[PDB]
Write a protein that binds this ligand. Sequence first.
Ligand SMILES: Nc1ncnc2c(C(=O)Nc3c(Cl)ccc(NS(=O)(=O)N4CCCC4)c3F)cccc12
Ligand code: NA
Ligand code: NA
Lengths: 402, 400
Amino acid sequence: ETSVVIVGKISFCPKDVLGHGAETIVYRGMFDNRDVAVKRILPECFSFADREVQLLRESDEHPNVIRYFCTEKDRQFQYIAIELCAATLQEYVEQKDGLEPITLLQQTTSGLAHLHSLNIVHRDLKPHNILISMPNAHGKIKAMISDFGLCKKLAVGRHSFSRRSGVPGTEGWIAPEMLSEDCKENPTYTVDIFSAGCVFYYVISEGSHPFGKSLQRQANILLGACSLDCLHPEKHEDVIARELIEKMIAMDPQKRPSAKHVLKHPFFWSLEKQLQFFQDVSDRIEKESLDGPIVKQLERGGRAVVKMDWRENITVPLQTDLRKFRTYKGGSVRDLLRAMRNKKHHYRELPAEVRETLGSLPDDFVCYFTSRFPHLLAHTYRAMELCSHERLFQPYYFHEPP
Amino acid sequence: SVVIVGKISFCPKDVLGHGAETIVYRGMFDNRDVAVKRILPECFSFADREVQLLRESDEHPNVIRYFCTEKDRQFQYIAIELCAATLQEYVEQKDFAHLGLEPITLLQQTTSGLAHLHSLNIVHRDLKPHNILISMPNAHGKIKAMISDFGLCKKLAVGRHSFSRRSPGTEGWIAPEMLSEDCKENPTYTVDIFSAGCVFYYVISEGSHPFGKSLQRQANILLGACSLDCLHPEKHEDVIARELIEKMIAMDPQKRPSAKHVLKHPFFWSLEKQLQFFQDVSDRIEKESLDGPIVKQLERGGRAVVKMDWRENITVPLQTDLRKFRTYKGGSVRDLLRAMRNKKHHYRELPAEVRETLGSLPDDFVCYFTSRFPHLLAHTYRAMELCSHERLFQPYYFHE
Ligand SMILES: Nc1ncnc2c(C(=O)Nc3c(Cl)ccc(NS(=O)(=O)N4CCCC4)c3F)cccc12
Ligand code: NA
Ligand code: NA
């Protein structure tokens, strides 16, 4: 048989190497009949390891933060046992190897939101540090934040920390305020949002980084020289994702959304929720004045969203079906929405050929319109910040708690 | 003193409770505060069961967390998460610190833990208030409910739905089919639903049990002699809860709903979602014929639900604002719903005193109608089972 090391409850074969984690090798192993990854730590890092561990313990469990099982000390080494995972997000993306990209980012973000709410800033969020679970008994996989080596629990009352309190991060993923010549403001929770923002693009672009190839990454970060050109400019899903990512990687940290703010963004909406947003908007503006601020804002830049005449950009059965009220102005955002609402509401009553083009409510119906009008949701989400304070629109927008 | 085994440590003075005639100490594991369960050689087979099954199912937030087992010369030790109290203390201890955990949410969490166990083919067999634990507060002062005590659990093999009634534990909360050899059907997952059903009634009645006081409980369960008399039959919230609980404690196991089905019941709906259900229903049936099977089902026994004429049982300002629509029939369930749909939609346009009588959307608005018409939801839910398969009605009903 091959070699096996046993240190109390922890056991592993040194041939079964899984990778590394900053610096210390990581082996596949066993603990309490659970499959676990096992990290061996040298004497010089004992002090650091214990501070990572305590922080992991003294911080509530969350499904998207990595489960810590046990540590066993030894005359030569220290041993940290955690959840065995299938891969890093890096390996997932690099190797192109069921699991939805958006759901992965959502789970990563919830893990981040959870840490921030415990006044923990991660400081080293990157594809290597986000682990992807083994499938559970029902086949389901999830993303999980790991590697708490640069973490900082900020004291109660503090909302920031010093740039120079440790290592700044991993070159390529470090927010500009950590390394810029002038420290105009101390870093806060928004360092992780910048990193997260870069991670998002990495996943969506299937391997690219907003600030370019590895060699010049950090220098471009300081210059603000990003390019999000893996995102199609006339594609709904990419338009939406560009809108979010741009804010997440903004040079001014105060302009970056909080982790909870990011989770409210249309990027993460189901198709049903998108359709429901369009309905609520339509209903809300049904008896609104064409010269009042809401419709002015909704029609500002509207010709481009509509593509001049929206009745020319739909399938023929719908063109035919929309010859009933000629009050639907083909160059109106309002009326386009108004028409969507009408054909969602009266869907059951519509001709069989018309229902065939649109597709079934809610998924295929909404995609019919978002596929054909790629700026419609992004434009409508922005304009209708005017009504964000209203009860109806509170699920779609983010507000700091009372 | 202080005892130490391997990684487990505890002071034997700090006793939290007792068990299989087993002791539970407050203690320590891997620098965590934990509960330490000490078990005798007699109950090692059932210590191995708990441990194995907690390792399979403790990822769920409402299942108790399992940390470590240490075997000894005389004893065995299981370290699990330390909890504040049991459900029994939460219900019966006077002026208990609820700490934001509402009854309905407690039961939703309990049931969600149960649905998790069932999806792993694990049947609990001993669910009762003593082993539904209330957590320690988290960093934001939130507490939660958790399932525990997995000694009597059972893992069924794949495509085994049923298990043999073995000779359990303590009486009071056990389904009839698990005790009486008189029953034709061997027990299944629905034994836990029965127990859950008694637990529901216990929580919302604030101490009472559908089959009576301790002495007569298990005898009443065999006889099928329940009483749900703490649920008032003309209060909305109690009519909804009664419909659910009657099904959960049914004498025929097959009639009891599964845990996922329970979680879909109106009992657990927000005020917003109840309103949304009324809106969807009204929209669904707007252009249905009055002689069709859906409206026929909706109007079957409708005069009682509407209190003969719903116009005579609403506030005066709403009466006036509805006189506009001449076609609304006072004896019609459909038109009551169409009236609710209409005024939700046109709410912001409505007159000041009509808005003021209805109350704000969605919560006060929906309660206006449910308070005055306590069978409306329960009736409409039952009736619109006809459209349960349709996509629109996916959030409201359960599809296997
Ligand atoms: N396929 C993989 N599965 C699991 N792990 C992997 C790793 C890894 O690095 N694992 C790992 C381990 Cl074994 C132990 C500690 C930490 N550090 S920690 O900060 O999470 N931490 C210390 C306080 C308690 C938690 C760690 F990140 C790297 C590559 C692949 C995998
Ligand atoms: Na976890
Ligand atoms: Na748990």
